[PDB]
Structure 1
Amino acid sequence: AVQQNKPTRSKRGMRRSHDALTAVTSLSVDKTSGEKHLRHHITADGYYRGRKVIAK
């Protein structure tokens, strides 16, 4: 499992071409407060469509 001849910056870049990152495509704004939380996700302050399901 040795190497035989040495790849360069070419291939050590090109292996990142699929392994790189994809951003989150859009966050969401709450329907009764107006702040930014993820989709199908509670906010920090205990909001998920209105009701205070949790304290913090």
Structure 2
Amino acid sequence: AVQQNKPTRSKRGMRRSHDALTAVTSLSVDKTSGEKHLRHHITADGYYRGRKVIAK
């Protein structure tokens, strides 16, 4: 139920070798508005594939 010995800082680091985050490979660029956005997501200004989706 509980440890018999204190795990080392080395063991702690090994377990965390899979905890690293992965950055987005790249951001798509709207053809009309020109700003960058997550692929398949609307831009901050309400554009998507240069169609000017609702922006209110």
What range is the shorter-chain TM-score in? 0.7 to 0.9
How well do the aligned residues superpose, as a CA RMSD in angstroms?
1.1
Q: Which portions of structure 1, spanning 4 or more consecutive aligned residues, are displaced by more than 4 angstroms?
A: none
The runs of 5 or more residues in structure 2 that have no matched partner are none
- When normalised by structure 1's length, the TM-score is 0.86
The runs of 5 or more residues in structure 1 that have no matched partner are none
For 2:25 and 2:11, the matched residues in 1 are separated by 29
- When normalised by structure 2's length, the TM-score is 0.86
Percent identity of equivalent pairs: 100
Corresponding pairs, count? 56
The one-character-per-residue Cα deviations of 1:3-56 (angstroms, maximum 9, x if unpaired) are 011111101111111122111111111111211101000011110011222124
